Ligand binder design. Structure first.
Ligand SMILES: *[C@@H]1O[C@H](CO)[C@@H](O)[C@H](O)[C@H]1NC(C)=O
Ligand SMILES: *[C@@H]1O[C@H](CO)[C@@H](O)[C@H](O)[C@H]1NC(C)=O
Ligand SMILES: *[C@@H]1O[C@H](CO)[C@@H](O)[C@H](O)[C@H]1NC(C)=O
Ligand SMILES: *[C@@H]1O[C@H](CO)[C@@H](O)[C@H](O)[C@H]1NC(C)=O
Ligand SMILES: *[C@@H]1O[C@H](CO)[C@@H](O)[C@H](O)[C@H]1NC(C)=O
Ligand SMILES: *[C@@H]1O[C@H](CO)[C@@H](O)[C@H](O)[C@H]1NC(C)=O
Ligand SMILES: *[C@@H]1O[C@H](CO)[C@@H](O)[C@H](O)[C@H]1NC(C)=O
Ligand SMILES: *[C@@H]1O[C@H](CO)[C@@H](O)[C@H](O)[C@H]1NC(C)=O
Ligand SMILES: *[C@@H]1O[C@H](CO)[C@@H](O)[C@H](O)[C@H]1NC(C)=O
Ligand SMILES: *[C@@H]1O[C@H](CO)[C@@H](O)[C@H](O)[C@H]1NC(C)=O
Lengths: 1001, 188, 50, 49, 49
């Protein structure tokens, strides 16, 4: 029988205390919700163990008492046996055979000794270390394993060496038990305050668990999260070559008795034939086979147009010259390999063949020349060489010689003076077709499917396809702009193929937030569904979502106009995104809408301003107080002094960023004892005396919602958080009590209800629209401040931009710090460990790999921190401009100081940034009306001085552009110009004259 | 674009971008600046332009009195945009420049797969298919070091370029807000 | 697409994951650039028949 | 411990305003760097001398 | 290493030999002879500005 494993069977990976932290590793872990096989206290079969086992028994009275382990349990090799009685553990290793299907009664090379209750264990062997982890708990469900999480603690850890792939449990005989299998998986572990594992995530369970592990987190927020690339596997593998008739002449080259001199070398051709090069490279006939840029095993994978057996005798000492980069009389004057030679040379002692009694002199070498020979060259002249100024005249002397010599090869010479045979394999290895090849004959040819391929030794992976890419008769490859392969021609059949690239794209997980649901959908970016519920879109294939025929507004953006959300029976829908509702504007040459009432918004905007200052002491970080590294780091010159200069210039510009934003006020202004502000309740945004720092109440919500020693130093800001709050208090006190005047001079006080009426003229809404609504507007501002308190209290996700910047800087440092654990190709990543292991030159190479890596890592950190500091400086120059234009001013720049026509802003300090409460006018009660560009009167055209002409449908009025205050049209809210005939779309009202009621008096 | 260089689509399709430029344009035409500061409040286009004359200190009667002329000047200027685009390479310099720079950066990134960086070949498969064990792995570590240094160079160059394109996208977001959704007083 | 190089590249730590994070941050920022440029509008307004 | 500038009780009330009777035409100097020496270190001649 | 060794309260489980901070650095240790459970506070340091 089978049942569930649930989330259970998790154990401590290593002997390191950690607390309040979400640690992670690859290990053998039990796959969440895998089967467990279920068994009864009646039966103990032999079972698989795979890589590792989660085991448990449920008893009142303990019937399981032990286990037997190994690959086979056969006792032909030693089998491990273990017994446990809760007070003690006993361990035995044996081949001397007991009962053949064992139980516990109510060449043995090693021994050691230390339903109500669920007795849990995890068993594994890794690297020869067999480990037992354990736990015990009461349980209430009799039939199946429990569903509440627990974690397992080590009892045994022994380097026994007996690896395991089967096991059998031991029953007590004169209750139930369960088994599930560990797999090599990445996992996440919730270590609590008391160093105890309290929850886990199986990263390989499902898309949400891949998301949880990507984020190293147990909660996951609503969104789309990238996970691994879907590299579409090749389905098959292709080999193509031309075919050939003979078998290679290796007996006639190497078993034949004859050989020649090195000044006048011999040659024989390998061509037109099948081969097995192991007949050479495994041969007993040779003392050596020197391969340069090659391992000889590869010669049966290669295929050759020809090979030439360039062959000669030299003495056993002088074989050293037959290598790239060498010089000396053989390499100089006889035969030479190229200094870039890729290929092989066969060599053997030939004293058994080429020596003769009295010494053989019939195999010879050139002793002098005017210049060295080229690679593979031959030269056979015998006239007397001269280097002395007195001529040689046909005989030898001081600096005068016959140009050839020979060694006098006796069958009993010392080995350096014995003859050696050499065969240089002068390759003709080419993009040209082979005439020699190994066992790798051709496959079939596969089309419109992604495959591995080889043609003549061009190799790769892709979708082979037939195409119109007609090569000229000599052309054998085709390529695109960047020299990538684009087409090929087959060597047996001269047909044309296009090599279309194989398929890939980032598997990305669409999820609602974990507290709302665990139902999920999976995008495959651009991938075709035929390679992957399943559904196709222009941005790729989409597993698990419900394709919707309707169209909501966007929520989680998928790509190419697709979005997804969790909706109904609930599902993760995916849809073609509505870009909002298709409002056909009720337009005509006489249709206007004029709003009859407003709202005041208080849209919160958040800006980062000053990322956490650091200095990384470049010597202490790179070198860890090493004397050795303190020396080696000098080799790089002023490298550390410029990285420390870069971080210091960043750090000074953070104090500058904060000074440029906040310190725009030349005096610390403060607010009055009496708060007579005409209805606007600032007591929430002004300072609170009831705190150790005088933050406002809203600043204290902001400071609650936003959230070291390795030569890293977090240097303080120049301005303390209380000084930053004294500046935002002075800014805000000026902003309230003096309006914009404190930026452009000395703060000139003005009553806040009158400042708000200035802020109305700056949006073209005449300021009577404030005061004639004053209490209502005060209540809209106060209620919006209420919505802000409620929002910021309920919605910790509101301060996205600052918590993002704090997370970027914390991730940047968690990268720079955890990079100290990276090897970069060093023996170790810990430098005092290197120096307690290693000494002198041996240390200095490894220390220089860590210096290179930590220097490159510190440079990468510093470079991204310089670019990020340029982003934060753009945001701080922007925030200093929102401070000047929105706080110390009122901006006319549309959508600069939040959406709507902006009235004013209040700075609130927040950690590593600023918050602006952009108070803005927004119209809110639209209505239809009839309109005209102008109005005729005494045959004069009239236009409004401010605002627009309007009619309800029967009577004519003028109003400001943004609020319906219908006023009678008059010669002082209008201006004349010219006459009515020119004016396309004029209408035939009468404008009233404010002198007329006085003429008529 | 095919050595793991996956190009990903924009969120908005070119058709959705055209629906937004249409919404922006239909808003602008039928309602003026009002659709940025609320919902679109309709107003006739001749009147939407008479607002724009006041936002440059030209008294708006100058438009309605010269309405047909100004319409023909706008139409003729639109024809000159068509003719400029139907002739001149320097009409669209900045975008063909940006496409070419991204293509040049990608062609550099791909031809850098053909660079040795001091390794015995630039094709990773050549090392894997002629050298065995640690010597192969040292030559591969030269290739990793060079390609990684070139990918760090590409991503660093693309971060500096994304800071430039972002400075241009913040400029275009600002010109959308202030020029389309409003009428900017900011000289030039 | 090879085993030996992929495991040598691990020795360099979060270079690869911060390069993919940098390009992802660039890529999401191109949608953010396009959204902040064009999506300054809540409804797809559309023109009259005349 | 640093000054943030002088502390000041602004003379606030629902009926108090201040207005400046006179000015100063502050010819402020702002210095913006615009270019720099156009180096071109030829990598060939620099790296290999 | 080098630092400020102390006795400590951290609840090491009976098999645990070492303890670490968030970013994977040695932060507490066990005496091998007496099984005392110790902090390792860092060696104090900084710039001489
Ligand atoms: C899991 O259990 C089912 C019965 O529910 C069984 O058919 C299946 O073979 C089991 N698979 C494994 C891997 O245990
Ligand atoms: C457990 O086994 C040990 C011997 O290994 C024995 O000393 C001890 O008394 C046993 N405990 C029980 C409860 O039987
Ligand atoms: C006992 O084990 C050894 C290997 O450890 C083996 O050589 C020997 O043959 C075994 N004894 C018998 C009686 O076979
Ligand atoms: C942690 O240990 C303390 C005693 O040291 C105990 O009071 C507390 O309940 C424990 N908390 C958890 C979550 O284990
Ligand atoms: C050898 O190649 C030719 C085409 O070049 C083909 O006709 C012939 O069938 C091939 N022979 C074998 C045994 O594959
Ligand atoms: C999670 O859901 C619970 C109710 O099931 C609620 O109390 C809690 O506030 C929610 N938290 C979040 C972050 O959604
Ligand atoms: C996916 O492949 C099929 C043929 O297998 C093709 O018809 C379809 O057009 C492809 N998908 C896309 C989005 O083009
Ligand atoms: C969408 O709905 C229409 C009917 O309203 C139907 O004909 C069409 O097949 C549907 N398409 C999908 C993909 O559901
Ligand atoms: C305005 O009038 C038109 C007349 O056709 C109508 O379609 C539209 O719904 C009206 N809109 C409002 C806001 O009254
Ligand atoms: C306004 O447009 C209507 C059709 O929509 C047309 O009948 C009328 O003539 C136009 N107004 C003027 C002044 O031509």
């Amino acid at each position: 029988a089978y049942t569930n494993s649930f989330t259970r069977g998790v154990y401590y990976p290593d002997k390191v205390f950690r607390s309040s932290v979400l640690h992670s590793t690859q290990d053998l872990f039990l796959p969440f919700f895998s089967n467990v096989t279920w068994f009864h206290a009646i039966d103990n079969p032999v079972l698989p163990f795979n890589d590792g086992v989660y085991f448990a028994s449920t008893e009142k009275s303990n019937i399981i008492r032990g286990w037997i382990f190994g690959t086979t349990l056969d006792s032909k090799t030693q089998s491990l046996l273990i017994v446990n009685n809760a007070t003690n553990v006993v361990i035995k290793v044996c081949e001397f055979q007991f009962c053949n299907d064992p139980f516990l009664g109510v060449n043995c090379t090693f021994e050691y000794v230390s339903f109500k209750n669920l007795r849990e264990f995890v068993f594994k062997n890794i690297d020869g270390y067999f480990k037992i982890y354990s736990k015990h708990t009461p349980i209430n469900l009799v039939r199946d394993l429990p569903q509440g999480f627990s974690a397992l603690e080590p009892l045994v850890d022994l380097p026994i060496g007996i690896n395991i792939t089967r096991f059998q449990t031991l029953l007590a005989l004169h209750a139930a038990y369960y088994v599930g299998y560990l797999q090599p998986r990445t996992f996440l572990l919730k270590y609590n305050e008391n160093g105890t594992i309290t929850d886990a995530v199986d990263c390989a369970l499902d898309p949400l668990s891949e998301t949880k592990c990507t984020l190293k987190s147990f909660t996951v927020e609503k969104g789309i999260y990238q996970t691994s690339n879907f590299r579409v596997q090749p389905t098959e593998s292709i080999v193509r070559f031309p075919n050939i008739t003979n078998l290679c002449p290796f007996g006639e080259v190497f078993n034949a008795t004859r050989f020649a001199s090195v000044y006048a070398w011999n040659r024989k051709r390998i061509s037109n034939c099948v081969a097995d090069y192991s007949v050479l490279y495994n041969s007993a006939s040779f003392s050596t086979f020197k391969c340069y840029g090659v391992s000889p095993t590869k010669l049966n994978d290669l295929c050759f147009t020809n090979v030439y057996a360039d062959s000669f005798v030299i003495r056993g000492d002088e074989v050293r010259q037959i290598a790239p980069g060498q010089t000396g009389k053989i390499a100089d004057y006889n035969y030479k390999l190229p200094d870039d030679f890729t290929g092989c040379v066969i060599a053997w002692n030939s004293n058994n063949l080429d020596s003769k009694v009295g010494g053989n002199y019939n195999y010879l070498f050139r002793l002098f020349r005017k210049s060295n020979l080229k690679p593979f060259e031959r030269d056979i002249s015998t006239e007397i060489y001269q280097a002395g100024s007195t001529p040689c005249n046909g005989v030898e002397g001081f600096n005068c010689y016959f140009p050839l010599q020979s060694y006098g090869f006796q069958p009993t010479n010392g080995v350096g003076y014995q003859p050696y045979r050499v065969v240089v394999l002068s390759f003709e290895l080419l993009h040209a077709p082979a005439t020699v090849c190994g066992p790798k004959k051709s496959t079939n040819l596969v089309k419109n499917k992604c495959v591995n391929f080889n043609f003549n030794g061009l190799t790769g992976t892709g979708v082979l396809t037939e195409s119109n890419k007609k090569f000229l008769p000599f052309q054998q490859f085709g390529r695109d702009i960047a020299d990538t392969t684009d087409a090929v021609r087959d060597p047996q059949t001269l047909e044309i193929l296009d090599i279309t690239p194989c398929s890939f794209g980032g598997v990305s997980v669409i999820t609602p937030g974990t507290n709302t649901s665990n139902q999920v959908a999976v995008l495959y970016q651009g991938v075709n569904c035929t390679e992957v519920n399943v559904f196709q879109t222009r941005a790729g294939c989409l597993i698990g979502a419900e394709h919707v025929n309707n169209s909501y507004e966007c929520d989680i953006p998928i790509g190419a106009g697709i979005c997804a959300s969790y909706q109904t029976s609930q599902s993760v829908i995916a849809y073609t995104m509505s870009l909002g509702a298709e409002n056909s504007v009720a337009y005509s040459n006489n249709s206007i809408a004029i709003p009859t009432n407003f709202t005041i918004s208080v849209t919160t905007e958040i800006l980062p301003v000053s990322m956490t200052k650091t200095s990384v002491d470049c010597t202490m970080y790179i070198c860890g107080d090493s004397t050795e590294c303190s020396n080696l780091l000098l080799q790089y010159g002023s490298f550390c002094t410029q990285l420390n200069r870069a971080l210091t210039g960043i750090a000074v510009e953070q104090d500058k960023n904060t000074q440029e934003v906040f310190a725009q006020v030349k005096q610390i202004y403060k607010t009055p004892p009496i708060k007579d502000f005409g209805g606007f309740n600032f007591s929430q945004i002004l300072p609170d005396p009831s705190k150790p720092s005088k933050r406002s109440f809203i600043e204290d919500l902001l400071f609650n919602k936003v959230t070291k020693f390795n030569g890293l130093t977090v240097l303080p800001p120049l301005l303390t958080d209380e000084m930053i709050a004294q500046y935002t208090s002075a800014l805000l006190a000026g902003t309230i009590t003096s309006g914009w005047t404190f930026g452009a001079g000395a703060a000139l006080q003005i009553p806040f209800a009158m400042q708000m009426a200035y802020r109305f003229n700056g949006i073209g809404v005449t300021q009577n629209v404030l005061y004639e609504n004053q209490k209502l507007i005060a209540n809209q501002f106060n209620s919006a401040i209420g919505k802000i308190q409620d929002s910021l209290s309920s919605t910790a996700s509101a301060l996205g931009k600052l918590q993002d910047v704090v997370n970027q800087n914390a991730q940047a440092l968690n990268t720079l710090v955890k990079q100290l654990s990276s090897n970069f190709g060093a023996i170790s990543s810990v430098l005092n460990d290197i120096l307690s292991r290693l000494d002198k030159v041996e240390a200095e190479v490894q220390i220089d790999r860590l210096i290179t890596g930590r220097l490159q890592s510190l440079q990468t950190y510093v470079t991204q921190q310089l670019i990020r500091a340029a982003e934060i400086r753009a945001s701080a120059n922007l925030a200093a401009t929102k401070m000047s234009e929105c706080v110390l001013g009122q901006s006319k720049r549309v959508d600069f100081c939040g959406k709507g026509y902006h009235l004013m802003s209040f700075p609130q300090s927040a950690p590593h940034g600023v918050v602006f409460l952009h108070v803005t006018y927004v119209p809110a009660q639209e209505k239809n009306f009839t309109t005209a560009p102008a109005i005729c009167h005494d045959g004069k055209a009239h236009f409004p001085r401010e605002g627009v002409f309007v009619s309800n449908g029967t009577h004519w009025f003028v109003t400001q552009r943004n609020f319906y205050e219908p006023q009678i049209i008059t010669t002082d809210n209008t201006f004349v110009s010219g006459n009515c005939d020119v004016v396309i779309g004029i209408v035939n009202n009468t404008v009233y004259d404010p002198l007329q009621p006085e003429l008529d008096s």
